Amino acid sequence: MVLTQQFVISNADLGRGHVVEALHPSSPLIALAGSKGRVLILNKTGKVEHQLPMQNVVAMEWECSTDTLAIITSSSSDVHLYTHRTRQTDTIDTKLKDLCFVCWSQSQPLFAIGSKSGQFVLYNRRTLRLVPVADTHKQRLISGMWVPAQDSRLLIISEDPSLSISDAEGKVLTTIPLPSVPKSVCVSGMANSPKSSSFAAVNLDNTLLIVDLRSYATAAGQFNSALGQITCLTAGINGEFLAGFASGTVALLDLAGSEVRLRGSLRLLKNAVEMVNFGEGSGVVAAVADNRVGLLRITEDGIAPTGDEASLESERGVPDLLAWSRDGQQLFVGTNQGNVTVFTLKVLNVSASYGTLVFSFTSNRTIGVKNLQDNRVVCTVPVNSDPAFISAGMAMLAAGVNNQVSYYEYFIAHSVFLRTVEYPSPVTDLKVNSNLAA
C-alpha cells in the first residue's frame, strides 16, 4: 500500500483520560474529547468554530434521524439537549444522579434512559405518558446498543446473571437464571426475513448458548478442550459470527441447526488474537495485537498468508481498542489513555456498467461485479493497483492508470488477468469488448 503522514495531534491538546467513541454510520465526523474541561471541535478544514465549556463526559452517541446531540452531567439528574444547528436548550430530568449511559436509536425517536440504581422509566413524549416499570434492573447498567433492523429491542448486560425478555410495555414474562455472568453480546435482527427468524447468543464463558426466542428450544454444544475459551465474540452481516479463541486459530462458524461443523483449523498466528472486529463496509477482519496490525482478505479457496506486517512504534502505546465505521472510509485506533489515531482509506469513486452488471470497488484491490437483477455481488476481480479509471465490457474488464491499462477476463465465477499495456500518451478514453480494445 501507500502510506503518508499528515499531522500528529499531541495528547497535551486532549489530556490524559478515557475517550468515549461515537461511530457515525454515514458522516465521517469523529468526536475528540478532553479531560481538562474543553472539547476540541475540528472540521475537515481544521477550523475551530467554537469552544464549549462542559465537563464530566460519560457517554456520547450520534442520531441519524434528527441529528440531535445530548449532554449529560455526572452531578445532576438533568440532561440537556444541545443542538449546534438550532442553539436550543431543553432539560429532561431523570430524577437520579450518576447516570450510567444514554443511547440514541436511528430508527425512531425512542431513546432509552438508564440508571445505576436499576430504575428505568418510559417517557412517551408524543403522548406525554410515563410508564414506570420497577425491579427490572437491580444494579448498575454497563453497556447497550440498539439493533439496526426492524426489531427495536435493546438488551443491557449487568453484573447479576439473569435473562429478562419483555414486550414494549415492560411486562416481565419470566426470569431465566444463568450459569455465569455475561461479558458482551451483540444482537442482529433480520428485517427482510419473510418468516422473521431470530436467535440469541449467550456467552457463558466455557459454553456458547443458542436460544430460540420462538420455540424456546436450547441445544448443548461442546467444543474440544484444546480449543480454549471464547476470548471475544462479534456479529457480522447476515448471520456471520466471528469468535475469538485462545489457541491462536481463527475460524468462521455457521449455524447448522443444533450442531456445528469445523471446515478447518489452522494456527495462522502463534499468539492469540486480542480483538476481532468485523467491518460492514469492507468485509475486512483486522487483528490488532501488541504493536502489530494484520489485514484479511476473503477468497474462495481458503486462508493464505498476507506477507505484509506493519511495525507500530511503542512510544505512543499499545493499541487496546479497534473500531470500524459502517461506511468503511476511515481507519481508527483507539486507546483508553486518550491516544486516538485516524488514517484515511481513499476508496476510488470510479465505477463501470455493462447491462445487468455494475463494476464497483468492493475493497482496496478488489472490484466486485454486482448484479442488478440479483441485488448481490456475483463475482470479483483482484486488481494489482488502484486504477485511474475502469472500463466494462463482456468477458472483459480494463483498469487504467495514466498511460497504461491492465486487462482482466472474467466470467459469471472466476476472473483471470490477461495482460498490461502502456501507450505513448495518456489514455483519455478507453472502451473494450472481448476481442478488441479502443
Which residue in 6, 23, 8, 104 sits closest to 277, CA to CA? 23
Answer whether 150's CB lies under 8 Å from 189's CB: yes
Helix (H) or strand (E) holding 421: strand 415-422
Which residue in 165, 154, 216 sits closest to 189, CA to CA? 154
Which residue in 339, 437, 330, 327 sits closest to 391, CA to CA? 437
Residue 322 contacts by C-beta under 8 Å, 6 or more apart in sequence?
A: 275, 277, 286, 288, 332, 333, 334
Answer whether 386's CB lies under 8 Å from 424's CB: no
Q: How many CA atoms lie within 13 A of 140 on its CB side?
A: 6
CA distances to 165, 218, 224, 250, 331 from 282, rounded to whole Å, are 34, 34, 32, 19, 11
Answer whether 33's CB lies under 8 Å from 11's CB: no
Q: How many CA atoms lie within 13 A of 383 on its CB side?
A: 27
Contacts 24+ apart (CB under 8 A), 115-120: 115/141, 116/140, 116/141
CA torsion 274-278-281-284 (nearest 10°) is 60
What's the CA gap between 60 and 429, in Å, rounded?
A: 48
CA torsion 172-176-180-184 (nearest 10°) is -50
E strand map for 58-119: 69-72, 78-82, 89-93
The amino acid that residue 367 corresponds to is I
Answer whether 178's CB lies under 8 Å from 185's CB: no
Strand ranges across the sheet with 397-401: 389-391, 397-401, 404-410, 415-422
Which residue in 65, 76, 142, 70 sits closest to 108, CA to CA? 65
What's the CA gap between 403 and 298, in Å, rounded?
A: 31
End-to-end CA distance of the chain: 30
What's the CA gap between 88 and 234, in Å, rounded?
A: 38
What's the CA gap between 322 and 319, in Å, rounded?
A: 7
Answer whether 367's CB lies under 8 Å from 381's CB: yes
Q: What is the DSSP string of 219-256?
A: E-----GGG-----EEE-SSS-EEE--TTS--EEE--B
Cell readout for 377 is: 455481488
Helix (H) or strand (E) holding 166: strand 162-166
What's the CA gap between 63 and 81, in Å, rounded?
A: 12
Q: What does the angle CA 5 – CA 7 – CA 11 come to, to the nearest 5 degrees?
A: 125
Q: Beta partners for 342?
A: 332
Answer whether 221's CB lies under 8 Å from 208's CB: yes
What's the CA gap between 240 and 402, in Å, rounded?
A: 40
Q: Decide: helix, strand or coil at residue 419.
A: strand
Answer whether 327's CB lies under 8 Å from 281's CB: yes
Entry resolution (Å): 3.5
What's the CA gap between 263 and 249, in Å, rounded?
A: 12
Answer whether 156's CB lies under 8 Å from 137's CB: yes
232-243 in b/e form (b: 16+ CB < 10 A) is bbbebeeeebbb
What's the CA gap between 318 and 289, in Å, rounded?
A: 8
Cell readout for 400 is: 487504467
Cell readout for 113 is: 434512559
